[PDB]
Design an enzyme around this catalytic site. Structure first.
Site, mmCIF file in Angstrom:
data_model
loop_
_atom_site.group_PDB
_atom_site.id
_atom_site.type_symbol
_atom_site.label_atom_id
_atom_site.label_comp_id
_atom_site.label_asym_id
_atom_site.label_seq_id
_atom_site.Cartn_x
_atom_site.Cartn_y
_atom_site.Cartn_z
ATOM 1 C CG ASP E 20 -1.957 -1.377 0.878
ATOM 2 O OD1 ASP E 20 -2.118 -2.203 0.417
ATOM 3 O OD2 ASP E 20 -2.827 -1.091 1.822
ATOM 4 C CE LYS E 77 -7.161 -1.238 -1.017
ATOM 5 N NZ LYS E 77 -5.960 -1.839 0.734
ATOM 6 N N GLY E 149 -5.530 -2.672 9.322
ATOM 7 C CA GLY E 149 -5.357 -2.077 10.137
ATOM 8 C C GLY E 149 -5.524 -2.329 11.797
#
EC number: 4.3.3.6
Lengths: 270, 269, 267, 266, 270
Positions: E20, E77, E149
């Site tokens: 990411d 995404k 996360g």
């Protein structure tokens, strides 16, 4: 006989606006704007919900200041079931006593026996049965409890529709079935048959709780109310005189859209 | 022929359009310039209604008239559900469309305005077919899917659009003998259900509302079978409102053109 | 046209319809002044008791009853059994009864009665149920009552429910009729038609538990346009007399002196 | 032509037909003579299975062979659900069709016969579209609606026929993007659901079974979209079985002709 | 045919780490450290959970900046069911679309119909049935949703074990019983039989959600994953280049403890 004259006294307020006032300045403004009566109290319903504390009958001193400041009828609040707060108000020489649910309840199970008084009473209701029971206890005028202190008309509409709805159901109802209808309403049969024969409430019906705008006032009138009560919402704005005048005009001209536009136009923050 | 059919017809003119919430004349001009097919005049946005709390009513006629005189495209305004007098006032100001809105504080929990008693046309919300058909029979000329206003989240709008169009498609092919029971289960008037079957769509213009925040959102609604979209103050709560406005208009016009959607979405912040 | 079938059924107003299992009984019912006969093989009281599945009767026996009288003949089709109805239409009977006294054949759907030339009777327990049957094309409504018992209590509940809601409707704020149609689950156009007329848009009869002249008369005084009566009549000593009594009772429903005379010595 | 498509094709030949439960050769001859498109051979009827209780299995091969040699129309027989060996035996007797039947005592609560592993075609029951598609993927060549056998009551058969045809119609008009989730909710193989969408009907012959007692019942099933009907020993528990048999055949042949239905019903 | 070529495209990422990246600086570091692809987004999954708000497709401007900054494939995404966000991404010319549950859900009941696109899709799953349903909808690559996360590998392990566990159950399973197994999984029967015959997932299976350390990455590989995704956790440390390089090395040398010790040694705060 003496009841019918109290009923008659309250018919004189038909087409009127009654305004909550906390002093003489406000009482004069309300009279000048064409209010048909003023309701004298020390702490408003919006600041009663918020500040908490116990809300009682106002100081007779302040009520007398308002009575001597105007020539229109003066009303004041007695806590529900507080028959002595009522005796005191009768003795001050005000025109109307409001047995109010906006004050702290004082009897959970019993309302004032209003027949034992010379001056007329207003009582709240949410449905027809509640109104008929207040009337039989000697209420000369009914208001729909609505939802005081919010500015939100939703509960007032629910209640007005409930009462007038059940009155209309009554009108066409088989006489044989009215006995059971009186049981289900928990209301006195003789006052239910009186309501059937009149096709309306046997006393003056006003709207109260959440009337904030001219459109609100007019909506209540179009739903079949005979008048409206309005809180200190009026006096918590920039030009109280103007907002007051607007609601009076709205109740007088409730079927005139052109009038409603003119009084609503530039009316500010509610 | 009928005065209803004329109001239905008036609303067809907005097909392929974007209607924009505007709180003043500055915003109304920007919306018209960006190619909005109509503007919706209100004082407090739906995102600040959820947040600030308080009671949300019909706007001040003064501010509505300021917006009406500031543009040549139709003007809409909100009446609280069931508040037939707020509607009377708006009819009398001379606006084009009344939105019987669930974004404002509800005023009758059990009854909607009797919209047939008005000369100007109404928009009503719905979440399913039965709700839309009931609003139409009450005289709504235009339906929006309630979605979930103030959030920027399209998920509820998609659920509702899919629900309505889904049930319309089920209806189209349905054995006639079974449509009686279908009308009972929808709690919808049988004659308007048979009209919907015969058309194969909603007998009035259907727009999407609630959570349309991006060009892609607007285009998604159009590809799901909506005739247009409503958009909140989200537009005017960004850096260049003119650009974000223009983008959503372009997206609804070119909803099946990915190349166009890329260009308007590019650098949109 | 629907209005033609509605009109056909108005001819039975003020009448008594009688369940008959053969031609002997059909003649007795006609002679006693029945406005129509209902042809079936097994009565509703022996359907509850013997158990088993209850269907449309044999067309042979229906035709025997049709050729034995000049008053209209009705027969029962199971609810939702649109083919049993097609067969009855084709035998040349006057009226089809989509009956809940027979075994249900569709739990979720009634016959689409508009697809037939001859008129249908349907049951109901409340206004919404009646309006839904009407919109499906029922030309005549009966209150389901409680067939096979001899007990009038359910018929009274239902008649009072229907007429009660019609009276509420008449005086009702127009703006509130939308929500009323939602809560009834009834078609809004037929509800507004009912408001305008101040009664049911078709002939309303009482059925289920009408056993005595007093029962028949009570139904009429509650606002019914006529009554159905079971084989209870023919399960007595003098069927001719008990039949004649109920006809007289429906004709003279507000005359107590008449009700005394027909009820007297009725066994 | 896959081996499955040939079995599907074999069953299409019964379209517009009546299949009759027969307990002996006398009854099998009557059923053939009355114009039955096939006979279903069993020892104890479904009405006497519910009543007498006990365990209901595949019939004695001796009695099935007596019925097979007594007629020239196809012969079917019942295997208990999941009993793949009762099926092997029936395949080996040389009958035309195996009925994996819920009227017999269940033999596997969790698994049906793997019908692809057989040369002759199978009939399976269903109550909804998902159930039918799952039987088809297991290799059923013909579906019947389970209805409610032994009662004479058409109500369950109507519920099931309406359920299946109802869901087929919903499918026809359905957004393609939404068919994935529809296949999940039906618990049915996605490829057979898309096949059903493209055909606008069941990828195999659909008959009605359970409670078809009268010509009117038979005709109602046909008007609801069935391709034929099964009928129990109800026929042979009457005065003139030949006549009642003939009536139901006539009813299925002329299902949209009320005048025909009146004559055979009288 | 066109599906098998999308499946094939994704097989090229076998043994790889996808990272990411929120900008071009980060994209270059990821490419330099030997990442087999980069995933372009504006707001990380750890700051999406925390800040709240709605998480959508990123601005095409920023995606194009990352695409022109590296020569390795770029992914982005689309919200689940948002087939138009996918159309836009296809049109920007990225290599892979991730139909992501880390973004705000946009359809509660339906996923994108991925067969209607030319470029390949990644989808999440927690069990075999979920993966097979995404594949039949046209997903060319599956990741285990894990728990994005958190930095916590526990959900990723649960899911990987669930999927591979059910694949192994399938391999030895009586053919007659696979029909009922497909019903219980709510998965298309033809893809279940394909999975039985292969003895693995008919597409590339990566691990995602909570891969924070080289040991995590290697554990995923030893459990039967074909590669791993890694969040901005990497770039929220002192020397991002080093932590990035470590996870690449770990996935390449997943069965070499000596290598894992060297890259893990002095690696700091995760």
């Amino acid at each position: 006989s003496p009841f019918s004259v109290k009923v008659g006294l309250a018919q004189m307020l038909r087409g009127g606006v009654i305004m909550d006032v906390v002093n003489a300045e406000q009482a004069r403004i309300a009279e000048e704007a064409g209010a048909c009566a003023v309701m004298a109290l020390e702490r408003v319903p919006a600041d009663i919900r918020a500040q908490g504390g116990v809300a009682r009958m106002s100081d007779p001193q302040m009520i007398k200041e308002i009575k001597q400041a105007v020539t229109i009828p003066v009303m004041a609040k007695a806590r529900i079931g507080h028959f002595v707060e009522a005796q005191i108000l009768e003795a001050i020489g005000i025109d109307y006593i409001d047995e109010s649910e906006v004050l702290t309840l004082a009897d959970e199970d019993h309302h004032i026996n209003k027949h034992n008084f010379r001056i007329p009473f207003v009582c709240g209701c949410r449905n027809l049965g509640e109104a008929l029971r207040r009337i039989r206890e000697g209420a000369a005028m009914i208001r729909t409890r609505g939802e005081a202190g919010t500015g939100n008309i939703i509960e007032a509409v629910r209640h007005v529709r409930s009462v007038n709805g059940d009155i209309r159901v009554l009108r066409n109802m088989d006489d044989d079935e009215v006995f059971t209808f009186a049981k289900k309403l928990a209301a006195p049969y003789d006052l239910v048959m009186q309501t059937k024969q009149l096709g309306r409430l046997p006393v003056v019906q006003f709207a109260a709780g959440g009337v904030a705008t001219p459109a609100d006032a007019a909506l209540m009138m179009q739903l079949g109310c005979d008048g409206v009560f309005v809180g200190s919402g009026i006096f918590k704005s920039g030009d109280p005189a103007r907002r007051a005048r607007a609601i009076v005009q709205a109740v007088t001209h409730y079927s005139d859209p052109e009038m409603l536009v003119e009084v609503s136009c530039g009316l500010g923050e509610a």
